[PDB]
Amino acid sequence: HGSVLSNILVIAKDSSAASSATSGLNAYGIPYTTLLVPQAGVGLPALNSSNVGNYGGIVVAAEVSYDYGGTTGYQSALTTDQWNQLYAYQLEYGVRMVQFDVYPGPKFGASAVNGGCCNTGVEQLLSFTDTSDFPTAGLKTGATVSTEGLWHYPATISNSSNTKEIAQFAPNAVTSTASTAAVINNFDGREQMAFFIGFATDWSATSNYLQHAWITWLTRGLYAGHRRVNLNTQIDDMFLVTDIYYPNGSTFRITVEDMNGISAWVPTINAKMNPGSSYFVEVGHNGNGNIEQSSSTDAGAAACNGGGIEYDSPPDTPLEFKKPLGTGTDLWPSTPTTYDWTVACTQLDDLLRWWTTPANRDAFGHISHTFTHEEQNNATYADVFKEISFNQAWLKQVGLDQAKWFTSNGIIPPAITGLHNGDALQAWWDNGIRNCVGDNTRPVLMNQQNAMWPYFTTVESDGFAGMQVNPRWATRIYYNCDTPACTVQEWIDTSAGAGSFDDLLAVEKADTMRHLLGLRHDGYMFHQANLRNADVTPITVNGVTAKYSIFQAWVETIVQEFVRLVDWPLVTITHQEMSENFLARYQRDQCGYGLSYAVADKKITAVTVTATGNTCSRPIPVTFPVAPTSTQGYATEQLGSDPLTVWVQLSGSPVTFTLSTPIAL
Numbered sequence: 001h002g003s004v005l006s007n008i009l010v011i012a013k014d015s016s017a018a019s020s021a022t023s024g025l026n027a028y029g030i031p032y033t034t035l036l037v038p039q040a041g042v043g044l045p046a047l048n049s050s051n052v053g054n055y056g057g058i059v060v061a062a063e064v065s066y067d068y069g070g071t072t073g074y075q076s077a078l079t080t081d082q083w084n085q086l087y088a089y090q091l092e093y094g095v096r097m098v099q100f101d102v103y104p105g106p107k108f109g110a111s112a113v114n115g116g117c118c119n120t121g122v123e124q125l126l127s128f129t130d131t132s133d134f135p136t137a138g139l140k141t142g143a144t145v146s147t148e149g150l151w152h153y154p155a156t157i158s159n160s161s162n163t164k165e166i167a168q169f170a171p172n173a174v175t176s177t178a179s180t181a182a183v184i185n186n187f188d189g190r191e192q193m194a195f196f197i198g199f200a201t202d203w204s205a206t207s208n209y210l211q212h213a214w215i216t217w218l219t220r221g222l223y224a225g226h227r228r229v230n231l232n233t234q235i236d237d238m239f240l241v242t243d244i245y246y247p248n249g250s251t252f253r254i255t256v257e258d259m260n261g262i263s264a265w266v267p268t269i270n271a272k273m274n275p276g277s278s279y280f281v282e283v284g285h286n287g288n289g290n291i292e293q294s295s296s297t298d299a300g301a302a303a304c305n306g307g308g309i310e311y312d313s314p315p316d317t318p319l320e321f322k323k324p325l326g327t328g329t330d331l332w333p334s335t336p337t338t339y340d341w342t343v344a345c346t347q348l349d350d351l352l353r354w355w356t357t358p359a360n361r362d363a364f365g366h367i368s369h370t371f372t373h374e375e376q377n378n379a380t381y382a383d384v385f386k387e388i389s390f391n392q393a394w395l396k397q398v399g400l401d402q403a404k405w406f407t408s409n410g411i412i413p414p415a416i417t418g419l420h421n422g423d424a425l426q427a428w429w430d431n432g433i434r435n436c437v438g439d440n441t442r443p444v445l446m447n448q449q450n451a452m453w454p455y456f457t458t459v460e461s462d463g464f465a466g467m468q469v470n471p472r473w474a475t476r477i478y479y480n481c482d483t484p485a486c487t488v489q490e491w492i493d494t495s496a497g498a499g500s501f502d503d504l505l506a507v508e509k510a511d512t513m514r515h516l517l518g519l520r521h522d523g524y525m526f527h528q529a530n531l532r533n534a535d536v537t538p539i540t541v542n543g544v545t546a547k548y549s550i551f552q553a554w555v556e557t558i559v560q561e562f563v564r565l566v567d568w569p570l571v572t573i574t575h576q577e578m579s580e581n582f583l584a585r586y587q588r589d590q591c592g593y594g595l596s597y598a599v600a601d602k603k604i605t606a607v608t609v610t611a612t613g614n615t616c617s618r619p620i621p622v623t624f625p626v627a628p629t630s631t632q633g634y635a636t637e638q639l640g641s642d643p644l645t646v647w648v649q650l651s652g653s654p655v656t657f658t659l660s661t662p663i664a665l
């Protein structure tokens with residue numbers, strides 16, 4: 001008999017060391033406790049009480065080792081007796097331990113082949129050779145990843161009766177033979193997973209890939225948490241004309257032929273994803289671009305009340321400019337006070353008639369990008385109020401708000417502007433707008449307490465309080481580019497860019513895997529000029545030659561690499577749904593939810609969900625590696641080969657689930 005709390009104990013020397021272990025647990029939502037061990041030492045928390053174990057797993061980074069000088073040399077800052085308490089806890093309560101960034105020694109059942117890893121720019125490929133100890137992790141065996149920049153130690157298992165190999169360093173320029181990279185130890189009942197390589201989840205995509213092995217193994221696939229990867233790709237500036245960067249003085253506006261190519265390609269890329277996936281492209285519209293196109297001819301202008309909204313744009317304010325409330329000057333023409341354009345006017349745009357066709361509309365996501373794309377950093381309430389309401393009426397008249405995938409309470413702010421203009425945010429709020437999207441290159445717009453949370457505007461910092469700013473990634477597929485030559489040129493001119501378009505896609509592949517394998521649900525920023533494909537020179541992406549747009553080439557690169565590494569689904573959700581999950585994630589993290597599991601004769605038989613007062617506004621996710629006896633009428637989730645996720649709604653009493661097949665320890 002006995003019970004164990006599902007809290008993960010993370011032991012490290014400083015907050016930087018612990019972050020390479022807590023970031024993964026935080027991404028899953030797994031409750032954890034951080035114990036920092038200075039060189040002077042520290043005492044361990046209460047590991048157990050009577051018949052209840054306080055921790056479901058232990059993670060130790062670099063053996064919390066310091067150089068004590070003298071003949072002592074490098075030693076763990078935890079005493080020998082403290083390490084024995086941890087080993088004793090592992091045995092009595094069946095708790096596993098993970099150690100990464102450790103040197104191969106007798107404590108890990110291995111010895112170093114003798115030497116460091118690889119210097120700067122020296123690659124050594126790494127791959128899992130046996131994933132049978134953590135099958136619900138969904139890692140594809142044999143797929144190679146990069147160790148460049150991560151110091152490691154090629155190792156050799158010394159006694160194969162207590163230590164098995166799960167990862168392997170490939171041969172390279174320094175080494176002629178493969179070697180052991182990670183092991184699992186069984187020391188007379190004590191189970192341990194040891195990684196002979198450093199971790200750096202802040203910059204390394206490889207580290208964010210590896211962490212899913214030790215997290216799944218440490219928890220046996222059973223934990224309070226949730227593993228989902230969202231792939232949301234937003235296309236700004238639809239119906240607008242954008243000035244192209246490389247062939248200066250040229251302009252591009254997406255065409256019907258271009259869009260037919262994108263439509264035909266969506267099922268193609270869907271069939272490349274693992275089972276359970278579901279991808280679509282979400283579009284942000286500017287209604288005034290539809291009126292201006294229809295008014296491009298003399299007779300068309302007569303059909304559109306003379307044309308759309310027209311004004312002179314002011315010079316851009318400094319970034320993060322907070323407009324003093326009540327100031328500014330209106331730019332909108334005084335004559336059109338309300339959206340008053342004819343349906344027949346809008347129909348003169350070939351691109352509109354395509355978008356309004358139900359078969360086309362219902363294959364994409366739709367959200368407002370303001371009517372005229374007016375920058376709102378220094379705009380007035382009156383201007384921004386019409387920027388929102390006009391585009392709402394246009395979306396309603398044209399029928400886009402009837403789409404299967406539509407966002408009604410959120411916008412993509414134009415060029416991410418007005419987020420510090422209180423009068424603008426109030427104009428959003430006075431219409432149905434409650435959330436929006438930000439820019440992850442501007443730290444002011446990101447949550448400073450937890451990356452998994454959205455930022456909430458404040459009266460002090462933004463002139464308005466309550467607007468939810470969801471994060472969004474930027475890419476080297478730039479907003480004013482329509483060809484590979486363009487993006488590569490702007491990447492070269494405005495960055496450390498160097499190489500071809502494949503070189504640009506290669507760095508985008510690594511950076512996006514770091515986001516996706518880190519369970520960052522942020523969307524990605526693209527623009528209408530990036531969809532140009534109908535008339536482009538064919539290029540080759542991963543050996544397949546086609547008339548890919550720069551947007552498609554990015555998605556092809558990202559999706560194929562994701563599928564090469566894991567078998568998880570890729571699920572696209574609307575901006576409205578994405579903002580909802582960001583809010584629910586933030587809210588349930590304030591309830592202090594926890595899990596505990598009961599053990600009966602060396603086997604896990606049940607779990608119990610709890611929170612502060614056993615109540616929470618939001619349901620608590622619980623991941624099952626074995627199906628419980630009954631989901632008890634709660635909302636469940638199990639796409640593709642994912643484990644079963646049960647959203648447990650706590651209402652005052654703690655909920656308990658019985659494992660249909662008990663998990664042996």
Ligand SMILES: *[C@@H]1O[C@H](CO)[C@@H](O[C@@H]2O[C@H](CO)[C@@H](O)[C@H](O)[C@H]2NC(C)=O)[C@H](O)[C@H]1NC(C)=O
Pocket residue numbers: 159160161162187188
């Ligand atoms: C390799 O590890 C195994 C497992 O720890 C060792 O097997 C133990 O051997 C001792 C003495 O021979 C026995 O008292 C234990 O009962 C054994 N344990 C198990 C689980 O079988 C084995 O001796 C090790 N090999 C070497 C060469 O030391």
Ligand SMILES: *[C@@H]1O[C@H](CO)[C@@H](O[C@@H]2O[C@H](CO)[C@@H](O)[C@H](O)[C@H]2NC(C)=O)[C@H](O)[C@H]1NC(C)=O
Pocket residue numbers: 314315316317318321327328329378
């Ligand atoms: C924000 O808007 C205000 C209001 O239009 C700007 O103030 C005007 O600035 C121009 C400079 O071109 C002056 O000629 C006007 O006299 C100013 N009017 C008032 C009422 O102050 C302000 O410059 C804008 N700031 C930014 C950064 O764009």
Ligand SMILES: *[C@@H]1O[C@H](CO)[C@@H](O)[C@H](O)[C@H]1NC(C)=O
Pocket residue numbers: 046047048049050088089092
């Ligand atoms: C923790 O469990 C051990 C047995 O493994 C026991 O000896 C010890 O007293 C417990 N700690 C408590 C009750 O504080």
Ligand SMILES: *[C@H]1O[C@H](CO)[C@@H](O)[C@H](O)[C@@H]1O
Pocket residue numbers: 626627660661662
């Ligand atoms: C519980 O589930 C396992 C497989 O998930 C079975 O092997 C067992 O018999 C029980 O049905």
Ligand SMILES: [Cl-]
Pocket residue numbers: 353
């Ligand atoms: Cl037609």
Ligand SMILES: [Cl-]
Pocket residue numbers: 358399402
């Ligand atoms: Cl319809």
Ligand SMILES: [Cl-]
Pocket residue numbers: 495496497
């Ligand atoms: Cl770069």
Ligand SMILES: [Zn+2]
Pocket residue numbers: 236237369373414415
């Ligand atoms: Zn835009």
Ligand SMILES: [Zn+2]
Pocket residue numbers: 316375415
């Ligand atoms: Zn601008």
Ligand SMILES: [Zn+2]
Pocket residue numbers: 236414415416479525527
């Ligand atoms: Zn944009």
Ligand SMILES: [Zn+2]
Pocket residue numbers: 473474511512515
């Ligand atoms: Zn990025």
Ligand SMILES: [Zn+2]
Pocket residue numbers: 274275567
């Ligand atoms: Zn598969």
Ligand SMILES: [Zn+2]
Pocket residue numbers: 191664665
């Ligand atoms: Zn076991």
